[PDB]
Amino acid sequence: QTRGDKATKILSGTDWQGTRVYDAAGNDLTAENANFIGLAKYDGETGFYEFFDKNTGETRGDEGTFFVTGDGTKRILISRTQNYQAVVDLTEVSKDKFTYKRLGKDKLGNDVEVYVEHIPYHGKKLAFTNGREALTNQTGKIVTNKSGDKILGTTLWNGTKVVDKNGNDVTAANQNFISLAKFDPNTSKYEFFNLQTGETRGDFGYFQVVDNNKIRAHVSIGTNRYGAALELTELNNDRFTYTRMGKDNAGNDIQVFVEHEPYQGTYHPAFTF
């Protein structure tokens, strides 16, 4: 069990409610950062979260993938309904108290570091509006009795091939998806690098393999901020493959499958963050 695994178990064990927002000195800034206060339901098994309104109990319409980094230091959210991502530094994860810090506002409207406290919620029984759906795309063995993250951590990887749903090669139509990829399971850091030059593609941040090894989720904190929760269709020491939208050889928009295998080139890329 990692420190992230321990945190995730605690987040999954109860519903939560934000209580107060404080600066480090304990000045109450809740009214100036009211939007940081709501209810939450976390399901570690499916790597899924949903937020609800503190006063009414109704969904905030914000659901998606969450995780805690392996080292226990950060929570990542990737919203599939509200088109954002967030990384926050965790300061406590205990059965009676969950706290993170981030940027907020003081009474004069200045930027300050604030701490958002939460305690267990025992009000309305909360249910996911949608939940993690079934994921049924598969192109090879998907290992489930070992940590997905640890499988990615075994080697540098590179994209080797892109195929359509019938196995037709469409790699030349999707070269933008072909990178040298580095994954660190302990820190949950990933970075993509150019295969020709060894240099970062400027796409880097935090990743985790979630949902019984069926999703690779990541958030880019680089030049172009985005997140993704990509369904894995093969995952083992020889190969991993995810599916997403791409192009066919004619330039039509189609479902594609991006295969990766352990990298055999000469580069030994370093994280640039």
Which residues, in sequence order, are CB contacts of 117 under 8 Å at separation 6+? Answer: 18, 19, 20, 21, 22, 97, 98, 99
Question: Given the complex with Cl ion, which of 116 and 152 has the nearer CB atom?
Answer: 152
Question: Hey, which residues between 210 and 229 contact Cl ion (CB under 5 A)?
Answer: 229
The residue count for binding Cl ion (CB under 5 A) is 10
Q: Considering the rule CB under 5 A, would residue 186 count as an interface residue with Cl ion?
A: no
Applying CB under 5 A, the span of 110-118, 146-154, 199-207, 219-227 interacting with Cl ion comes to 146-154
- C-alpha to C-alpha distance for 40 and 96, rounded to whole angstroms: 14
Query: Considering beta carbons, is residue 138 or 236 the nearer one to Cl ion?
Result: 236
208 lines the binding site for Cl ion (CB under 5 A): no
80 binds Cl ion (CB under 5 A): yes
Q: Is 104 in the site for Cl ion (CB under 5 A)?
A: no
Shorter beta-carbon distance to Cl ion: residue 81 or 194 = 81
From residue 73, alpha-carbon distances to 92, 188, 189, 225, 245 in Å are 9, 10, 12, 20, 32
Q: Quote the longest CA-to-CA distance of the chain.
A: 61
Piece of 96-104, 171-179, 181-189, 237-245 that binds Cl ion (CB under 5 A) = 237-245
Q: How far is the CB of 235 from Cl ion (least distance, A)?
A: 8
Residue 169 near Cl ion by CB under 5 A: yes
Name the site residues for Cl ion (rule: CB under 5 A).
Answer: 64-65, 80, 146-147, 168-169, 229, 236-237
